[PDB]
Design a protein around this ligand. Structure first.
Ligand code: CLA
Ligand code: CLA
Ligand code: CLA
Ligand code: CLA
Ligand code: CLA
Ligand code: CLA
Ligand code: CLA
Ligand SMILES: CCCCCCCCCCCCCCCCCC(=O)OC[C@H](CO[C@@H]1O[C@H](CO)[C@H](O)[C@H](O)[C@H]1O)OC(=O)CCCCCCCCCCCCCCCCC
Ligand SMILES: C/C(C=C=C1C(C)(C)C[C@H](O)C[C@@]1(C)O)=C/C=C/C(C)=C/C=C/C=C(C)/C=C/C=C(/C=C/[C@@]12O[C@]1(C)C[C@@H](O)CC2(C)C)CO
Ligand SMILES: CC(/C=C/C=C(C)/C=C/[C@@]12O[C@]1(C)C[C@@H](O)CC2(C)C)=C\C=C\C=C(C)\C=C\C=C(C)\C=C\[C@@]12O[C@]1(C)C[C@@H](O)CC2(C)C
Lengths: 177, 168
């Protein structure tokens, strides 16, 4: 009856055990929202998209700062400020990436709403397993848990890197030391 | 359910299997409120127009017709051809063809039996049975889509950088 994460709180009604990373940590009861097209399905899809985006962004920042930029690309070690140097010399790359992300996000929203309507697609599912790393069950649950935990950690990390780069105008590991 | 192209999206519910080049790609559901034959005709018309346009752009940046008016790049050829009246002739004959097309598409939508884009233009055969016709329709659709995207890229790159045939 009590949430596993917060023993002083009752179990959130909509979070039983199903989703990976579920420990009952919903103090504000946001999982019970059923308005403005927002429900547990939409919240989970948003969480998974945030997890994946944060993982990609943190990996990119760390890669560029440690191993350096790719040939022909600007340096500076400040990832929040090197973006304007890339846009100053290769605006077409940024524009094409933005257009591609826009199209993919329109497709993602359509897929989310459709799967919410005629329930056949789990939240965050895009059938993207080209290498077959999660075919069999009893490993899919473990992979989902790993992805969720890594994505939450990378969300926090990427938000921290964004704020550090905006404020200190220095590199992430530069702030570290 | 679970359209072939986008495996996580539902089938567009208007494209089951009985159209050439039908991989179930309609995420925004254009076929849900527009006739399928109308959209097919529009797509095939775009394919043919853009194939001709890509070939003409690339060729005219290499070979020029005799005369001083034809000595401009394809990027600047529009303002020269419109002034000389060269594009007026193309406009006149294209308008005639498109009025006949108005009649044809109206008849196709109101029964008839004319397949979308089927003008029966076939001096040579190149398509003897149903299988050959289907294969060549798929080839035409794929080549037309590729040429539409290719002309888009060619024009955008040439406008961005006023370069010759290599528009990099
Ligand atoms: C420009 C084109 C474009 C379009 C049309 C979309 C469309 C969409 N995105 Mg999206 N996105 C884009 C570009 C785009 N994205 C780019 C370039 C990125 C960064 C790589 C993202 C990152 C992103 C994330 C991380 C999420 C979406 C989500 C969504 C969906 C919810 C839209 C909504 O209600 O937001 C309303 C618009 C807002 C700005 C509201 C957000 C306000 C928050 C509180 C800002 C917090 C800032 C703090 C620091 C929708 C399908 C969400 C989703 O799929 O949920 C299911 C989601 O979680 N997008
Ligand atoms: C959220 C994900 C994300 C985003 C938005 C970016 C964004 C960027 N990266 Mg990047 N990167 C990422 C993840 C990401 N990266 C990951 C996961 C890795 C590791 C594989 C890298 C490795 C990487 C390198 C090695 C370099 C960049 C560079 C760049 C910049 C120019 C390239 C470009 O337009 O990207 C779109 C590019 C393609 C689609 C190709 C741009 C600011 C370049 C740069 O200027 O860095 C300073 C560069 O040299 N990235
Ligand atoms: C810690 C990293 C990590 C892990 C463990 C997973 C794990 C998973 N992802 Mg995933 N993903 C990640 C990062 C990760 N992701 C990032 C950064 C992105 C953004 C590019 C995505 C984008 C993504 C999509 C679009 C989809 C998945 C899917 C999946 C599931 C099946 C595929 C699989 O076995 O992947 C195993 C992954 C690894 C072994 C990581 C090796 C490095 C599985 C639970 C699919 C899913 O949810 O199906 C239901 C799916 O459609 N992921
Ligand atoms: C994900 C984990 C994580 C880690 C390891 C760090 C680590 C660090 N952060 Mg940080 N940060 C994080 C998340 C994290 N942050 C998040 C989620 C945010 C909010 C978006 C911030 C916002 C933030 C700011 C605004 C600043 C730091 C700073 C720092 C550095 C000084 C640490 C300290 O105690 O100084 C005290 C240190 C390298 C400081 C720094 O760069 O020092 C020069 C600094 O000014 N962080
Ligand atoms: C979308 C189709 C299209 C359009 C609008 C244009 C437009 C133009 N072309 Mg052009 N061209 C095209 C296709 C096209 N071309 C193709 C496919 C080729 C390859 C043979 C060429 C080869 C070409 C050359 C070599 C030159 C032009 C030039 C020009 C410019 C002025 C003279 C002229 O009209 O061309 C004259 C066109 C030709 C001599 C060949 C056209 C052959 C046609 C397109 C193929 C048969 C299709 C058939 C007749 C369709 C019937 C239509 C129906 C309604 C009845 C003008 C901007 C001239 C210029 O100023 O260059 C900058 C020039 O020197 N074009
Ligand atoms: C790769 C080029 C290509 C291909 C394979 C086709 C294929 C086809 N076209 Mg077609 N077409 C094209 C370009 C192409 N088109 C262009 C650029 C135009 C504009 C002038 C047209 C205008 C056109 C008309 C007006 C008609 C067709 C028709 C046809 C079909 C029977 C004729 C045939 O076998 O064509 C053979 C073509 C080739 C072998 C291409 C090589 C040429 C060098 C077939 C599906 C007919 C149809 O709808 O039948 C069902 C018909 O009435 N086409
Ligand atoms: C049909 C496929 C195709 C191919 C092979 C290329 C190929 C290329 N494009 Mg491109 N492009 C295409 C379609 C294509 N484009 C489309 C449909 C658009 C949108 C209209 C663009 C918009 C575009 C821009 C804006 C730029 C390129 C650039 C480039 C070059 C890098 C390379 C030669 C770049 C380049 O070198 O331009 C000078 C560049 O800046 N493309
Ligand atoms: C930003 C604009 C907000 C848009 C609101 C969309 C839905 C939000 C909503 O209705 O839930 C608002 C959420 C949902 O609140 C939940 O509602 C459920 C019934 O609908 C149950 O009653 C839950 O117990 C209750 O917590 O409540 C809060 O988050 C209030 C927290 C305020 C903290 C201030 C510090
Ligand atoms: C209606 C809709 C879409 C939809 C739909 C459909 C289509 C109807 C389908 C469904 O049926 C429903 C629904 C709702 O899904 C809404 C669209 C979404 C919006 C409104 C898009 C918002 C995106 C904004 C982002 C993601 C911007 C991020 C900015 C960053 C800046 C980066 C910086 O580097 C910059 C530039 C400068 C640097 O110095 C430092 C920083 C600041 C870090 C980080 O990235
Ligand atoms: C949109 C795009 C790029 C957009 C870039 C933009 C907006 C950038 C704009 C800017 O930089 C400028 C210009 C100047 C700056 O000052 C301002 C900004 C704004 C910064 C590229 C698309 C590029 C699109 C591309 C490359 C498409 C390739 C498509 C292929 C290969 C298709 C293949 C098929 O069609 C066939 C062949 C057969 C079919 O049946 C099957 C498939 C597979 C679908």
């Amino acid at each position: 009856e009590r949430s596993k994460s917060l023993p002083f709180l009752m179990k959130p009604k909509n979070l039983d055990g199903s989703m990976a990373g579920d420990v009952g940590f919903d103090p504000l009861g946001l999982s019970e929202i059923n308005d403005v097209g927002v429900d547990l399905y939409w919240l989970r899809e948003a969480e998974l998209k945030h997890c994946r985006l944060g993982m990609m962004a943190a990996a990119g920042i760390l890669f560029v700062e440690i191993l350096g930029p790719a040939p022909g690309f600007p340096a500076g070690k400040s990832q929040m400020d090197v973006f304007w140097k890339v846009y100053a010399e290769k605006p077409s790359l940024i524009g094409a990436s933005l257009a591609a992300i826009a199209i993919l996000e329109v497709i993602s929203g359509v897929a989310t709403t459709q799967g919410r309507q005629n329930g056949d697609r789990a939240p965050g599912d895009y059938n993207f397993d080209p290498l077959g790393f999660g075919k069999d069950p009893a490993k899919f649950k473990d992979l989902q848990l790993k992805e969720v935990k890594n994505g939450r950690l990378a969300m926090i990390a990427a938000a921290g890197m964004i704020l550090q780069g905006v404020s200190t105008h220095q590199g992430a590991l530069e702030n570290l030391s | 359910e679970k359209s072939k192209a986008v495996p996580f999206l539902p089938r567009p519910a208007a494209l089951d299997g009985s159209v050439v080049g039908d991989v179930g790609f309609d995420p925004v559901g254009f076929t849900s409120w527009l006739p399928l034959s109308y959209l097919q005709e529009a797509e095939i018309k775009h394919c043919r127009i853009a194939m001709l346009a890509t070939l003409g752009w690339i060729v005219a940046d290499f070979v020029h017709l005799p005369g001083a008016v034809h000595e401009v790049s394809s990027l600047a050829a529009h303002d020269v051809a419109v002034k000389s009246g060269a594009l007026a002739q193309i406009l006149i004959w294209t308008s005639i063809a498109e009025a006949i097309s108005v009649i044809a598409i109206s008849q196709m939508l109101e029964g008839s039996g004319r397949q979308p884009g089927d003008f029966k233009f076939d001096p040579l055969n190149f398509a003897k049975d149903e299988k050959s016709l289907k294969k060549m329709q798929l080839s035409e659709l794929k080549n037309g889509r590729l040429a539409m995207l290719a002309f888009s890229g060619i024009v955008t790159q040439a406008a961005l950088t006023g370069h010759a045939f290599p528009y990099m």
